[PDB]
Every structure is written in C-alpha cells, then in structure tokens.
Amino acid sequence: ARAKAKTRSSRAGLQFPVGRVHRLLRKGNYSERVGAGAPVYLAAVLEYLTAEIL
C-alpha cells in the first residue's frame, strides 16, 4: 500500500478534470451522495459540448 499517481481524467480517457468535476458536484448542494461515474459521465459531456463549439 504505497502505489500512487494516476488521475481519473486519464482513466476515463478524457481532457476535462473528472476529479474537479467530482468535487464541484460534491460541494454544490446537488445531492447528499455522488456516484463514482457521475463526474466521469458529466466531464465527458462538457468535453464534447466544448469540443463541438470549438
């Protein structure tokens, strides 16, 4: 148990910050609990809507 480094954005194959998105969900008063996929799905959508506009 000392095996560190990887980011969730990298796991999901994304550019947008999954971790940040997660925190933002958690800190936003949206729901008491937040699934582990919730931010991944969301971030990916924001990536796509961002990419489409650009």
Which positions lie near DNA, rule CB under 7 A?
A: 1-9, 17-20, 22-23, 33
**Tokens 């008063």 map to which residue?**
29
Determine phi and psi for 51, rounding to 5 degrees. Answer: -60, -40
- Near Cl ion by CB under 5 A: residue from 7, 11, 19, 37: 37
CA nearest 8: which of 24, 20, 19? 19
Q: In the bound complex, what is the minimum distance in angstroms from residue 49's beta carbon to DNA?
A: 20
11 near Cl ion (CB under 5 A): no
Interface ranges with Cl ion (CB under 5 A): 35, 37-38
